[PDB]
Amino acid sequence: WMPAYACQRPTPLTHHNTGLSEALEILAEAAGFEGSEGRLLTFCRAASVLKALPSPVTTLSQLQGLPHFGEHSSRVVQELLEHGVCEEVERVRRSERYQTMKLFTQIFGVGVKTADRWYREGLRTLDDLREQPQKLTQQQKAGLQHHQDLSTPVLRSDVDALQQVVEEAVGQALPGATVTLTGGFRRGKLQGHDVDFLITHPKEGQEAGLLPRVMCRLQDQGLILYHQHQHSCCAFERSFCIFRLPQPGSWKAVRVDLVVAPVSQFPFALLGWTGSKLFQRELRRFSRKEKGLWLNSHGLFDPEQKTFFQAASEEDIFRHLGLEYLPPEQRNA
Ligand SMILES: Nc1ccn([C@H]2C[C@H](O)[C@@H](COP(=O)(O)OP(=O)(O)OP(=O)(O)O)O2)c(=O)n1
Ligand SMILES: [Mn+2]
Ligand SMILES: [Mn+2]
């Protein structure tokens, strides 16, 4: 038996059902491209169940008793087991709609709504986008300029080099300020699409004005290709960057998100930013539906009492929600 919420079970980085989960995730992604959010979530949940299993699914009889495995997902696994291929998945892969939506949405600064609009307006290729620069934001222009590098998986070796320069800039700007690697790399991933860093200082308020100083230092070192700074609006101060990472004999553009949180909110920010995306969605749904609390990256709010939970760590937050603690490497839902 396996619990229904992804936040109630460990999901390790590596598992026994990668073929099956990949197929389901292609269908989830395609659903998202069509605005079918219910179907996306359904396929994502089924895939995440497969990732939690201790053994490969070799026969359809092994699906018995598993949550989030309705008819459609079961059929997909069945076809794969029996024929080595699922016709629906193959049709999606070969479809111009899917291929174009994948192409566009992968670009830095492009979401589903933008990609769909462009598709509807007859754009198909990266060259098509470059021929219509008036349709692009400055962020999207930068994404197109560096698209080859940005499509190349970011490696742990890149992360370690980037963490060094970010730590050096932070330390020189403000002694005592800290840099914490978050995102997929905190969960143990060997690769990723970017590097996510969370910045704070143990004295609340000492982090004010830190990020612009950090960016000035990095820019002066030639390490920044693109930088968009945004102050907290609603809602953390952040900088969406493309770094120029030096390599032996060359260099590589790499997406980096730098996020500043006040130390009082750090545990919530670390939890939120560590993911996985599905793990956090499930954690938020659990908090709301089972405990009547609203969890986000800033806090944990009781809407009846109008109170916020004071957490010193991620462990505190899990405990407060009545969940066994899962370290980041078991959040790979
Ligand atoms: N729609 C989103 C987007 C992001 N996040 C959170 C969870 C992610 O882990 C984190 C960082 O976002 P990324 O897109 O960088 O996700 P990962 O770092 O997990 O994956 P990758 O290896 O592709 O960078 O922010 C989220 O909850 N919901
Ligand atoms: Mn990331
Ligand atoms: Mn990111």
Swiss-Prot record:
One of its GO terms (molecular function) is DNA-directed DNA polymerase activity. DPOLM has a reduced ability to distinguish dNTP and rNTP as substrates, and elongates them on DNA primer strand with a similar efficiency. It is able to polymerize nucleotides on RNA primer strands. It is an enzyme of class 2 (transferase). The keyword Hydrolase does not apply. Its main location: nucleus. GO terms for cellular component: nucleoplasm; nucleus. The chain holds residues 137 to 494 of 494 of the full protein. It comes from Homo sapiens. Mg(2+) binds at residues 194, 196, 257. Its cofactor is Mg(2+). Its EC number is 2.7.7.7. It is found in: Nucleus. This is DNA-directed DNA/RNA polymerase mu. It catalyses: DNA(n) + a 2'-deoxyribonucleoside 5'-triphosphate = DNA(n+1) + diphosphate. Belongs to the DNA polymerase type-X family. Residues 187-196 are annotated as: Involved in ssDNA binding. Expressed in a number of tissues. Abundant in thymus. Keywords: DNA damage, DNA recombination, DNA repair, DNA-directed DNA polymerase, Magnesium, Metal-binding, Nucleotidyltransferase, Nucleus, Phosphoprotein, Transferase. It comes from the Eukaryota. GO terms for biological process: B cell differentiation; DNA recombination; double-strand break repair via nonhomologous end joining; somatic hypermutation of immunoglobulin genes. The record marks 272 as: Responsible for the low discrimination between dNTP and rNTP. Gap-filling polymerase involved in repair of DNA double-strand breaks by non-homologous end joining (NHEJ). Participates in immunoglobulin (Ig) light chain gene rearrangement in V(D)J recombination.
